[PDB]
């Protein structure tokens, strides 16, 4: 009969880079 | 006979973090 | 005997959003 099923694979590749982050605060006054 | 194919492995990990956001808005008029 | 290795796992989730961006300008005089 067969033998054993093999391991599980190698994990998946890194996740792609997150979204660009919020605008930054205001400047200041004139 | 070898056995079948392991199971896909696990997630890859999460993704690093996106850009820093755009400047912000101009200050209030002086 | 074994049999070979199951493929790669699926890709990771998006990153975290990036960081605030830097101030803004001067307002007008």
Same mark, same amino acid.
């Given at each position: @009969?067969?033998?054993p099923?093999? @391991?599980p694979g @190698?994990?998946?590749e890194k996740g792609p880079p997150g979204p660009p982050g919020?605008?930054?605060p205001?400047?200041?006054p004139g």
């Open positions: @009969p067969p033998g099923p093999g @391991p @190698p994990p998946g919020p605008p930054g205001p400047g200041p």
